[PDB]
Amino acid sequence: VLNQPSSVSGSLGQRVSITCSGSSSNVGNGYVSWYQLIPGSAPRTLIYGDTSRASGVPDRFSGSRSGNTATLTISSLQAEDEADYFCASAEDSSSNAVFGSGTTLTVLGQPKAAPSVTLFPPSSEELQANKATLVCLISDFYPGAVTVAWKADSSPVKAGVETTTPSKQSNNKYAASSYLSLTPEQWKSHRSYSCQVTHEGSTVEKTVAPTEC
Amino acid sequence: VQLRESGPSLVKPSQTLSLTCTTSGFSLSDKTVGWVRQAPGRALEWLGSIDSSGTTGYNSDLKFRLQITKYNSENQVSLSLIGATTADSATYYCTTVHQQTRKSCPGGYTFGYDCGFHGWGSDDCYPDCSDILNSDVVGPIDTHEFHVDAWGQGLLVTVSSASTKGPSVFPLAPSSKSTSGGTAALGCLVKDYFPEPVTVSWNSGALTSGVHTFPAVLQSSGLYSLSSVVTVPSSSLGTQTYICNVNHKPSNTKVDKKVEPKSC
Ligand SMILES: [K+]
């Protein structure tokens, strides 16, 4: 494994460098490549032979090497550059390839944005199947950190909660989801349920009730 | 080129994981085909490759478990990994790769061939062409060249003794209280499937703006669930039909669920 920093960040318009440190038998052999992994897409080759750009790669992505350390430099950072970057090299033979440990690039400076929250009660179809899931969808927020808490009536609920880690939407804002699994009897035995989302010290709460729909 | 991985999504511990790579038309007979994998949260890892002549090269650490085979007549390349464990759960990609060892001479030297030495010494490096037995001859510099030219989409393979389960799909219907003025969110809940993954589209791909499919959660039962959501104009809810298309390739299941707005 070649050694990269687990994370780097820069602001829009600025320049960042991702290093890849190896040994004289891999990076020092002088033919390093770089790869871009966007969540959801297949890997994309960016750089080969230390410095050569793959087709479609703008000039603001540049590769270089000094001894046993190679560097990917991204200038004029754009929001679309957020991704995982990996280096690679042959080691002692063209068939023995090694990859770097990966670097998550965070691009800073986009506008803050408060979450929109939609809470769905169990569907009629799910209840007739003798199940009940409340679905709390959290969308269009930045930055990407939220806390989610569930209440039955007004008391906290921890059993039966699952929450996903926020990840970016196609419009470059974050979204997340949370779930409260109940039996149909528990669902019917309370007057209301709530999902409350805390973002940057402020809280949005949505409520549903068995008697309202 | 467009490479396609196929094979079982689920493999029991100690059984053999097998995959096949095919194209959408391009020939693989003149290209080197390789396999790369990435386990959740881990780095890319090289597995091996097979060149046009049928010669294979493997990751040293896995050479004893791997077998890569080529079938020119079917335009196919296969991979096998014996003794599967949970460490082998990963997304598996087939690729075409550039793989070769370039020989070059140090600065100021010339290959024997360029000196007229077409037999003995033609592949050595000479400071000049005076003598085929020049004592100042040196060996060539080896540059091992590797990069991935084309990448497949990847096939997630899970290693587990639990059994496949296809999903139950439930509507997340918009309601009078749940709109946002001009727009409304509606969705699909895709419950209790194994293994990953599920993918979701809307109206067979004709609806792409506003769509987000969330990552899966793992429940205590060992079964996954996720949701998908789309934002549409609130005015269209009485007239436009909305269907989520759910694809669960590990169970060979597709579900088209119509999502009806509530009367509430
Ligand atoms: K060498």
Author numbering:
A (entry chain L): 3 to 9, 11 to 27, 27A, 27B, 28 to 95, 95A, 95B, 96 to 106, ...
B (entry chain H): 2 to 82, 82A, 82B, 82C, 83 to 262
Paper quotes:
The cow antibody repertoire contains a unique subset (~10%) of antibodies possessing ultralong CDRH3s, which can reach lengths between 50 to 70 amino acids. The unique CDRH3 structure can be separated into two microdomains where the antigen-binding disulfide-bound “knob” sits on top of a long b-ribbon “stalk” and can bind to both surface and receded epitopes. Ultimately, we isolated a total of 8 and 11 cross-clade nAbs from cow-485 and cow-488, respectively, all of which had ultralong CDRH3s, suggesting only ultralong antibodies were responsible for cross-clade neutralization detected in sera. BnAbs from cow-485 were named Bess, while bnAbs from cow-488 were named ElsE and assigned numbers based on their order of discovery.
